[PDB]
C-alpha cells in the first residue's frame, strides 16, 4: 500500500530478448508517480546493438505499478507488493509476427526491479518491424477483467507506419500477484506511450507513459 509504494518511485529493468533469432540485452532505469500514472524510462542496448528491428515492439515491455486508479477500483498490481507480480504477454501482429513476454516485478531497497524475457518470431524480413518502418503506438485501451485468479488485459494495439496507415497487434496479458490480493471487476486502462528521445540507431531510448484506469460500468 501507500507506505511501500510512495508517490515517487524509481525502477530498474533488465530485458533478455530474441527477435527472429537476433539476441540482445537492454538495461534501463525509470522513475514516475505511481498514483499519477506517469513514468519515464531510459533504456540502453547493452548487447546485440544496433537492433535490426523496430524499437516499437519493445517499448510496451518497459510497468503496471504506475497506473492511476480511481479509489473504488482495487489496484491489484500495487497491492501485490512488496512481493510483486508476474505477467505473461502474447502479441499477435497482423502479418504473423509473434511476441511473447514474461516479466517479474518485485520491490528491493525501495525500487521496483523488472526482469523481462522476450521472444519475437516470424516477422517477415520485408515487413515494417524488420525494415524499421514503424512510428510509435497509437493511444491504447486495455480491457481488464479478472479470470482464474489473475487479472487479464486485452488490447487492439496499433503501430503507426512511416508511409501512413497502421500495423495491428492483438495483445493478451495475464498479470498475477505472487500473493492473493483483491481482484478488481472489469475496467479499462487508457495508455499513451511516447518515445521522447533516441539516438540515431536506437541504442539509447527515453520513453514516457501515461496510464489511467477508467470505469467500464
UniProtKB/TrEMBL annotation:
Q: Does the keyword Cytoplasm apply?
A: no
Q: Which residues bind Zn(2+) 4?
A: 148
* Ligand binding (Zn(2+) 3): 147
Where along the chain is Zn(2+) 6 bound?
Answer: 198
Q: Does the keyword Metal-binding apply?
A: yes
Annotated residues that bind Zn(2+) 2 are located at 138, 166
InterPro entries per the UniProt record, alphabetical: GFP, GFP-related, Green_fluorescent_prot
Spell out the protein name for this chain.
mOrange
Native organism: Discosoma sp. (Sea anemone)
Give the molecular function GO annotations: metal ion binding
Q: Which superkingdom heads the taxonomic lineage of this protein's source?
A: Eukaryota
The residues listed in the UniProt record as binding Zn(2+) 5, with positions renumbered to this chain, are 154
Binding of Zn(2+) 1, residues:
72, 215
Supply one GO BP term.
generation of precursor metabolites and energy
| Assigned protein family | Belongs to the GFP family.
Q: Name one Pfam family in it.
A: GFP
Name the UniProt key words of this record, in alphabetical order.
Chromophore, Luminescence, Metal-binding, Photoprotein, Zinc
Amino acid at each position: 500500500n501507500m507506505a511501500i509504494i510512495k508517490e515517487f518511485m524509481r525502477f530498474k529493468v533488465h530485458m533478455e530478448g530474441s527477435v527472429n533469432g537476433h539476441e540482445f540485452e537492454i538495461e534501463g532505469e525509470g522513475e514516475g508517480r505511481p498514483y499519477e500514472g506517469t513514468q519515464t524510462a531510459k533504456l540502453k542496448v547493452t548487447k546485440g546493438g544496433p537492433l535490426p528491428f523496430a524499437w516499437d515492439i519493445l517499448s510496451p515491455q518497459f510497468s503496471k505499478a504506475y497506473v492511476k486508479h480511481p479509489a473504488d477500483i482495487p489496484d491489484y498490481l500495487k497491492l501485490s507488493f512488496p512481493e510483486g507480480f508476474k505477467w505473461e504477454r502474447v502479441m499477435n501482429f497482423e502479418d504473423g509476427g509473434v511476441v511473447t513476454v514474461t516479466q517479474d516485478s518485485s520491490l528491493q531497497d525501495g525500487e521496483f526491479i523488472y526482469k523481462v524475457k522476450l521472444r519475437g518470431t516470424n516477422f517477415p524480413s520485408d515487413g515494417p518491424v524488420m525494415q524499421k518502418k514503424t512510428m510509435g503506438w497509437e493511444a491504447s485501451s486495455e480491457r481488464m477483467y479478472p479470470e482464474d485468479g489473475a487479472l487479464k488485459g486485452e488490447i487492439k494495439q496499433r503501430l503507426k507506419l512511416k508511409d501512413g496507415g497502421h500495423y495491428d497487434a492483438e495483445v493478451k496479458t495475464t498479470y498475477k500477484a505472487k500473493k492473493p490480493v483483491q481482484l478488481p471487476g472489469a475496467y479499462n486502462v487508457n495508455i499513451k506511450l511516447d518515445i521522447t528521445s533516441h539516438n540515431e540507431d536506437y541504442t539509447i531510448v527515453e520513453q514516457y507513459e501515461r496510464a489511467e484506469g477508467r470505469h467500464s460500468t
